[PDB]
Amino acid sequence: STGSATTTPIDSLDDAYITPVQIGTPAQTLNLDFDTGSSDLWVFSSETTASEVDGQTIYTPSKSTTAKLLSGATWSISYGDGSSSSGDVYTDTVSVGGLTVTGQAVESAKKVSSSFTEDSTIDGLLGLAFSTLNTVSPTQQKTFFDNAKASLDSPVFTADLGYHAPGTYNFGFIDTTAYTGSITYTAVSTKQGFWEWTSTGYAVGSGTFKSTSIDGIADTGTTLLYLPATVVSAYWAQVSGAKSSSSVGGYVFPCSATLPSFTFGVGSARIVIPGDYIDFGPISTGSSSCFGGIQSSAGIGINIFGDVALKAAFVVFNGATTPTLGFASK
């Protein structure tokens, strides 16, 4: 089997991407944030504290003839950005772009943090990291991909995120029309439960490539590109007036600037992030200070190849017995 679904930016800045997901019988369609940095499929629901729901579409398990309470199971997750959610668990039928999993754990939120409430466009998350990170207790549950894998034509999914435009998540096949050149594959460590890999270096604009190993994670659920302070300083030094602002929370730059591209290495291959992908707009409405899309990972504890990087590539998440990651230009 295969599946193919369009993923759409939630706003004009590509702050996140939402993908429609069918849950239950009859289908209830929710728009979920596909997150290769976590491993829980959780949704706003009829059980979510009413004051914490503000415009989201909810899953109502009582209206699904295939929903079953997973007795005794609870979940609770905290994300790198400080947001969180928790609740109980149902199993139900879940379909993405025509690919159906029966008995998928659907984690129903009883509580969500303010950031989730305040984002009316995101009805929940669909985790695509390794199932070892799943938070359900006392019996850990499998991701949608893990459940689907054996049925797929090939045990892969691909992320093709758009810049200020829709893109695609495919399951079970590689669309050879969706990228240019070849796909370069690189090793993955699953030791921390992430799609963790090592970039071979970087360049800023038309500058020379610096060969250096950068361990990080391919994370569709993180907006920005978080890299070591040395790398990030080298980038922003090429933008007149750019500075790190403790009050704002990262590098800012004059909105009048033209940003240089940023290249990262995948083996001997190179992925070029155009400068415009690195512009996250005014820090506050009407400001002429703009927020940068490349930020320091110092004090995160891990480098993160988030959407800024991934949207410059066609990305293969290869879930073979020994997982790997593939990147192509597009």
UniProtKB/Swiss-Prot annotation:
The Gene Ontology terms for molecular function here are: aspartic-type endopeptidase activity
| The Peptidase A1 domain, residue ranges | 17-328
Q: What is its EC number?
A: 3.4.23.22
Main enzyme class: hydrolase
Q: Which key words tag this protein in UniProt?
A: Aspartyl protease, Disulfide bond, Hydrolase, Protease, Signal, Zymogen
Please name the catalytic residues of this protein.
Answer: D35, S199
The alphabetized list of GO BP terms reads:
proteolysis
Instruction: Name which cysteines form disulfide bonds.
Output: C255-C290
Q: Which reaction does it catalyse?
A: Hydrolysis of proteins with specificity similar to that of pepsin A, prefers hydrophobic residues at P1 and P1', but does not cleave 14-Ala-|-Leu-15 in the B chain of insulin or Z-Glu-Tyr. Clots milk
Family indicated by similarity: Belongs to the peptidase A1 family.
UniProt-recorded name of the protein: Endothiapepsin
Organism for this UniProt entry: Cryphonectria parasitica (Chestnut blight fungus)
Traced from the root, the source organism's taxonomic lineage reads:
Eukaryota, Fungi, Dikarya, Ascomycota, Pezizomycotina
